[PDB]
Amino acid sequence: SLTHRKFGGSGGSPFSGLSSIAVRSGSYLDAIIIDGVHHGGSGGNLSPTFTFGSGEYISNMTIRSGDYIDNISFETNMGRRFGPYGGSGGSANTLSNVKVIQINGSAGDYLDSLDIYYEQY
Amino acid sequence: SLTHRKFGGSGGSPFSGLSSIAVRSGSYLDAIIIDGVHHGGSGGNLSPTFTFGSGEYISNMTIRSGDYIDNISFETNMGRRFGPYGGSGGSANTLSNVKVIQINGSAGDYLDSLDIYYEQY
Ligand SMILES: CC(=O)N[C@@H]1[C@@H](O)[C@H](O)[C@@H](CO)O[C@H]1O
């Protein structure tokens, strides 16, 4: 049962545990890199690193996928954009008016799957 | 509305975007360091970094807090312990039988608050 709980007081600027995103891709996704940590294989080319600013988060995400992840692009609430990186294969699925909280998944030599935790607004 | 969605197929080995945790602390938390990214002040003392192995996640977590996060400890599904690190004041709150998905918060010179995203079992 997916939930969240707050602890602590009212001070501070807010932050996410999810700080940055990169991928290795060719015609597939070989890897996703999250806060610098590699998940996947060695194939494809390494994209530049997207680092979220304070209060920035993924609000819109397009992922083409089949048995693997074929492509990823997203947009933030601040208008910045990442991708698309990958091939034209797979089915396109979209997330819109969301807030991505976390990005988990399953990887071998290629990025097989992503489990995207998010708030739907 | 908090939720999630899986894209892609059924192979590969599971990974989490949440891979490492350290804190800076004395009698309360100055900072939490999540996968290498520093959130909060220069104060207190830097804990060793906890790095989650393949298939390991937080299953139990005790937080003390008041206006600030005062203490964190957690246990993983694999019997590993992080902390307790911090002070003995504020009120104690425990998550048991969980899987922690994400740790967000607010931070200034100190760690003010955490918003913990988790599956409750
Ligand atoms: C063959 C095709 O048209 N689309 C495939 C899809 O079925 C496959 O599972 C996916 C992920 O590996 O890659 C696409 O290119």
> Closest approach of chain A CAs to the CA of B78, in angstroms?
19
Residues with CB under 6 A from ligand 1: A 66-68, 70, 87, 89-90
Tell which CATH architecture fits domain B18-121. Aligned Prism (2.100)
Q: Are residues A24 and A37 in contact, defined by beta-carbon separation less than 8 angstroms? A: no
B121-B58-B119-B16 Cα dihedral, nearest 10 degrees: -140
CB within 8 A of A79, min separation 6: which ones? none
The DSSP secondary structure of A35-63, one letter per residue, reads TTEEEE-S-SEEPPPEEPPTT--EEEEEE
The token pair that represents A79 in the structure block: 């208008």
| Cβ atoms within 10 Å of A94's Cβ, excluding its own | 10
Q: Cite the beta strand spans of B35-110 per DSSP E.
A: 37-40, 45-46, 50-51, 58-65, 69-76, 81-86, 91-95, 98-107
User: Which of B36, B110, B118 lies nearest to residue A3, judging by beta carbons?
Assistant: B118
Interchain contact, A114 vs B8, CB within 8 Å: yes
Cα B8 to ligand 1 centre (Å): 10
Interchain contact, B12 vs A113, CB within 8 Å: yes
Q: Solving technique for this entry? A: X-ray
Residue type, B63: I
